[PDB]
Amino acid sequence: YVRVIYQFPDNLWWNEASNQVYYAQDPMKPERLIGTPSIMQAKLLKILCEYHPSPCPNDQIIKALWPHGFISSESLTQAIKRTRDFLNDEHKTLIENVKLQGYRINIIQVIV
DNA sequence: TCTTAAAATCGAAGTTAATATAAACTACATAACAGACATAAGAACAAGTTACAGACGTATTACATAAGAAAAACATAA
User: Which residue numbers delimit the OmpR/PhoB-type domain (predicted)?
Assistant: First the structure.
C-alpha cells in the first residue's frame, strides 16, 4: 500500500490510511487521539498537503471542496476556522493564512 | 386780466438682435499658483459568533417467526 503519514508541529500525526489525527504523547506513540475529521476537513487537508510548500489560492481550494457549487467565501473562511479549531490550532501555526496569497499547512515530515 | 413759456400726449399687435477717434518709470505689498505632507474617509481580506437547516442516526412502538418448556394424551408393562 502507498501509505502516507504526515507529521505536524507539536508532534501532531495524521494517518491517511485510517484518516485519523492524534496527539503524540511520546515521539510517535498513539495514545491521545483527537479523532476523525469530516469529509471536507480531510479534503482541505489533502489540498494543502498536495500543494506543499506552495500556498494554495482560495479559488482552487473552493473548486476542490465544492466542484459544482456556487458557495460563498464565508463558507471557505468558516471551514478553515473549524478545521483549525478541531486541530486545536489557536495560535494559527498549523494552517497559516498566507497574506494575500491563500493558505499553507505546516508539515515537518512525510513517512511512507 | 392778458401774453408767454413750460408740460404732456400722440392705436394695437407683428417685427425688432451691437459697434468701431483720442506718458513713463520705480518701489512695494498682496494675491495666486504649484508642490508636498498628513489626515480623515474608504475599501478589501480575514476572523469570531450565533443560529438555522438537512439529512442522518437514535429511541419508541408494534410485531413474525422459530426455539424451548410445560402439559395433556396415549401406549405399554406389571
Answer: 3-107
